[PDB]
Amino acid sequence: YFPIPVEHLEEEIRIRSREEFNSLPSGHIQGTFELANKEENREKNRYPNILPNDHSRVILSQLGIPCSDYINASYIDGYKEKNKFIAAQGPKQETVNDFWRMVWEQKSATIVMLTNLKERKEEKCHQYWPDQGCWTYGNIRVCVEDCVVLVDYTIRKFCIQPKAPRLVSQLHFTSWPDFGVPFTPIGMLKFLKKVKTLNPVHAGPIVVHCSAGVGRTGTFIVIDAMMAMMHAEQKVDVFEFVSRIRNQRPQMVQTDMQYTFIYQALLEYYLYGDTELDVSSGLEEEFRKLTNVRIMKENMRTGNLPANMKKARVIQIIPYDFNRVILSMYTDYINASFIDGYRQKDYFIATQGPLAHTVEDFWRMIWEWKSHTIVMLTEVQEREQDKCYQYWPTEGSVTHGEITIEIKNDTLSEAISIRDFLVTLNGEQVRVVRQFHFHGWPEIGIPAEGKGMIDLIAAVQKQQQQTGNHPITVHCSAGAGRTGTFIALSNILERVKAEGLLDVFQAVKSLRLQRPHMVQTLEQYEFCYKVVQDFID
Ligand SMILES: [Cl-]
Ligand SMILES: [Cl-]
């Protein structure tokens, strides 16, 4: 196994689709585990087969209690940086205090948690931080100063002290699935950049932990190391590195499926890599790339089954089977897909304009997924083409099957008209649903301003925080295009306000992987940039 030039990475990935992974050394033959197996230390290890060797063991200061030296953690090098990380086992009740003493004695500023607390009812790691307020863990008082919950990870700011108090930031990756590795490595690369951002140049080693302290924790350390190697050597050698880190902590990467995943992340980071940009700071090429996002046509069964054919305005813009909106019972089908927002999963329902023969279903979707906000981006007719069925009453009330819609208020503001309805189901019988009907999109082309588009996003956000905080029903006609533009800018703008960063490309690309042809035309993509420019001023 020799190094792969990045020039040939994509090809070698194809060719290798297990044997490589099985040739790695299990770090056990050049190692010594005397200290880890001491009787005194038995109860301190979560898994008795996954133990630090004596040489790279993190060694705590001796606290007159015997065998107080020990913790299940080991130093791990980065690409050209001795001891960049500490790969630690996720602490348990009995070692929570010893854990913080490590963070303190090692001068660490960052903890990377790659596990959830419980997994399918099995406790994979004990909570070692206060929910609210403060807690003294031994001679170290930890205090929560902030918690920010984004969709793929959450971020916690601690203030630890026993003279100078110190700020430790915990980055907790929530998205990692129970069984197997993730799906895209998109989330993990963004997460890994946020760690680079929040760790100070002067700080101690980064504490990375999962359950056993080898596996996720390993795939994470390797992906960082190998990004470094690309950015320096223009070549990647995953095999020689995993081999190296195992002689510091054995078993570092745990699965065949994990080893492959390092490569996928590395490829993603090469092919698409730098498309993020800071709000401080051509599109043609980026759009070509977006357009080469494969459509998972295998994974589109339900939407193509014969009965469901007739229910779609465009038999080509149709939900993937995994993130499709499913209703109470082929009556389970509505051309509509769940889409991740910036702060939570399944935050938007991106749907088509109801057909005259799918209003019943439409309103069942709204009712069954507790939607209270509808964003409409077309008019009923456009250029003499019937682009959406009017599903809402204008004057009185209308009953679409079991649901009843009665219109309470209807205010035509600048660009957006804003209707209010009492949706009933013929004491949890009645809701108030609010429709934002955007008249600011031209019958042909994109709008040339985007003040009115900023003002709609903004309007829908207040409505969300008030009628808090359910999934938003966005539709136009085809159910991807404008819906896409809107969902994209919603997420892009939230993050600009929040992180002061801007990655339109990945934003849209992430939309393409949830529903086909989401942002659709280069016009609409250009527009995204244009609205962000307008927002910045
Ligand atoms: Cl949890
Ligand atoms: Cl694991």
Residue numbers in the entry: 112 to 128, 136 to 181, 183 to 281, 288 to 406, 425 to 472, 478 to 574, 581 to 691
Paper quotes:
We also report here structures of two tandem-domain RPTPs, RPTPɛ and RPTPγ, revealing the domain organization for the PTP subgroups R4 and R5. Superimposition of all five tandem-domain RPTP structures (CD45, LAR, RPTPσ, RPTPγ, and RPTPɛ) showed that the orientation of the D1 and D2 domains is highly conserved and root mean square deviation (rmsd) values of less than 4.4 Å were obtained, for each pairwise comparison, considering Cα positions of both domains. Surprisingly, sedimentation velocity measurements showed that all single-domain RPTPs studied (IA2, IA2β, GLEPP1, DEP1, and STEP) were entirely monomeric in solution, as were tandem-domain receptor PTPs (RPTPα, CD45, RPTPɛ, and RPTPμ). The determined molecular masses calculated from AUC velocity data ranged from 68.5 kDa to 74.2 kDa in agreement with the theoretical mass of monomeric tandem domains. Moreover, analysis of tandem-domain structures showed that the orientation of D1 and D2 domains is highly conserved and is incompatible with the inhibitory wedge model due to a steric clash of D2 domains. In the present study we showed that this is also true for RPTPɛ, which is in the R4 subgroup together with RPTPα, the prototype of the inhibitory wedge model. In the fourth category, both the gateway and secondary pocket are blocked and the inaccessible binding cavity harbors an aromatic residue or a proline in position of Arg24. The second-site loop assumes a twisted conformation in these phosphatases. This architecture is present in the subgroups NT5 (PTPH1, MEG1), NT6 (PTPD1, PTPD2), R1 (CD45), R2B (RPTPμ, RPTPκ, RPTPρ), and R4 (RPTPα, RPTPɛ). RPTPα, RPTPɛ, and RPTPσ displayed a more limited peptide recognition capacity in vitro, which may be related to the presence of a bulky residue in the gateway region.
